[PDB]
Amino acid sequence: ALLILMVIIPTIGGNTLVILAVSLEKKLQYATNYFLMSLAVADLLVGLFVMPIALLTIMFEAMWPLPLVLCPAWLFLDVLFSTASIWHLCAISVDRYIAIKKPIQANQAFIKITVVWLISIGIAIPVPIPNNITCVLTKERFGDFMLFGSLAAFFTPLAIMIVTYFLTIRFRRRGAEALERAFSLKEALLAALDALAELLALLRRLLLPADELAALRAALTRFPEFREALLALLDRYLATRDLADARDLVWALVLAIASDPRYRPAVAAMIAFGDAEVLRAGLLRGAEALGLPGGEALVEEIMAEAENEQRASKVLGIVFFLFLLMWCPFFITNITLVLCDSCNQTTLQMLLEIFVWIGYVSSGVNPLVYTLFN
Numbered sequence: 212a213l214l215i216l217m218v219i220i221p222t223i224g225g226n227t228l229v230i231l232a233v234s235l236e237k238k239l240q241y242a243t244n245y246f247l248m249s250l251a252v253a254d255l256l257v258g259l260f261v262m263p264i265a266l267l268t269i270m271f272e273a274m275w276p277l278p279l280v281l282c283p284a285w286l287f288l289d290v291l292f293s294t295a296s297i298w299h300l301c302a303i304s305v306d307r308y309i310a311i312k313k314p315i316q317a318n319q320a321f322i323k324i325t326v327v328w329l330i331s332i333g334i335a336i337p338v339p340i341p342n343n344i345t346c347v348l349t350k351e352r353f354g355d356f357m358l359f360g361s362l363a364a365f366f367t368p369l370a371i372m373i374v375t376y377f378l379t380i381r382f383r384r385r386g387a388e389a390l391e392r393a394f395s396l397k398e399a400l401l402a403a404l405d406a407l408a409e410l411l412a413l414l415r416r417l418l419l420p421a422d423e424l425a426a427l428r429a430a431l432t433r434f435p436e437f438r439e440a441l442l443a444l445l446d447r448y449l450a451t452r453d454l455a456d457a458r459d460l461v462w463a464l465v466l467a468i469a470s471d472p473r474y475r476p477a478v479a480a481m482i483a484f485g486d487a488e489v490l491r492a493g494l495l496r497g498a499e500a501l502g503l504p505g506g507e508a509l510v511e512e513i514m515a516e517a518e519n520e521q522r523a524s525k526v527l528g529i530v531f532f533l534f535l536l537m538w539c540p541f542f543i544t545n546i547t548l549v550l551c552d553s554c555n556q557t558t559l560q561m562l563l564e565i566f567v568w569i570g571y572v573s574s575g576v577n578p579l580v581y582t583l584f585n
C-alpha cells in the first residue's frame with residue numbers, strides 16, 4: 212500500500228524547487244513569480260502538516276491517536292492551507308488583470324502576499340471555536356461553517372478568478388484582432404487600435420487637422436526613443452496624402468509604442484494572441500519605415516518578449532484548469548449534504564472522503580506543470 216505514501220515526496224520536492232528557483236536564479240523573479248513562491252510554500256506546508264497525519268488517521272479508523280491539544284489546531288491548519296492555496300491563484304489572476312488594465316503605475320509584492328494570508332487566516336478563525344476524541348468535524352457542531360467557509364474558500368474566489376483570468380485574455384485578444392486588421396494592408400485600423408490600446412485618435416483625425424498639428428508634434432516628441440524619425444515619417448505621410456504613407460506611419464507608431472517601457476508589457480500580451488506572423492511582418496515594415504538601423508534587433512526582441520507572455524498564459528491556464536477540475540467536486544458535494552430531504556448520509560459521506568483527498572493532490576501538480584512547460 213505505497214500508492215499515497217510516496218506521493219508526499221513529489222509534492223514537497225516540487226514545492227521546494229519552486230521556493231529555491233525564484234529566490235536563487237534571479238532570472239525568474241518576475242512580479243507573478245513571487246505569488247508562485249507563496250503558493251509553493253503553502254503547498255509545501257500541506258506536505259508535512261496535512262498529508263502525513265491525515266493518512267495516519269486511516270490506520271486509526273478515523274480516530275485521533277495523538278495528543279488532543281492539537282486537533283483543533285490541525286483542523287485550523289487544514290482550512291487555512293486550502294484557503295491560501297485557492298486565494299493565491301485568485302490573487303495571481305486579479306493581479307494580472309489589474310496590471311494589464313492599468314500599467315501606468317504597475318510598470319513604474321510582499322504586501323499582497325500578507326493581504327491574502329491574513330484574509331485566509333480571518334477565513335479560518337472559527338475552527339478553533341468512556342469516550343475518546345474523534346476529529347471528523349461533524350456537520351452538527353460545525354454546521355454553519357460547512358456552508359459559509361466553503362462559500363468563502365471556493366465560490367467567492369472562483370467567481371472573480373474566472374472573470375479576472377479572462378479579463379486579461381480579453382485585452383490580448385482586443386489588441387490581436389485590432390493589430391491584425393492594422394497589418395491587413397481602409398482607415399479601420401486606428402478606430403479599433405484606439406480601444407485596443409486602452410494620441411491614437413489623432414491618427415484617425417489625420418486621415419485635416421488645422422490646429423491639432425501642434426499637439427501631434429508634441430506627442431511625437433513625447434517618445435524620445437523613436438526621436439525625430441516619427442516626426443519625419445509624419446511629415447512624409449502628410450506630404451504623400453495617406454495611401455501607403457499613412458500605413459507605414461501607423462506601423463512605425465505602433466513599433467515605437469511597443470518600444471516604450473510603459474506600453475511594452477500590454478502590447479507584448481496582445482501580440483501573444485494572434486498569428487504571430489502577420490504581426491511580425493507589420494512590425495518589420497514599421498522598422499524599415501522608421502529608419503532605426505538597430506530596428507531588427509528590437510522587433511525580434513519584442514516578438515521574443517511576446518512569446519514569454521504567451522508561455523506564461525499557457526502554464527497559468529493549465530494550473531487554473533486543474534484547480535477547477537480537482538477542487539470542484541469536493542466543494543460541490545460539501546453543500547449537498549447540508550441541504551437535503553431524503554439523501555442518505557452514508558451515500559454522501561463516502562464520496563466526501565475521497566473528494567477531500569482528491570483536492571489536496573493539486574498541491575503536487577503545479578510545480579509539475581512548470582517543469583513540463585519550462
Ligand SMILES: CN1Cc2cc(Cl)ccc2-n2c(nnc2[C@H]2CC[C@@H](Oc3ccccn3)CC2)C1
Binds near residue numbers: 294347360364568
Ligand atoms: C477525518 N477528516 C477527514 C479529513 C482528512 C483529511 Cl486528509 C483532511 C481533512 C479532513 N477533514 C475532516 N473534516 N474536515 C476536514 C478538512 C477540513 C475542513 C475542510 O472544510 C473546509 C475546508 C476549507 C474551507 C472550508 N471548509 C474539509 C477538509 C475529517
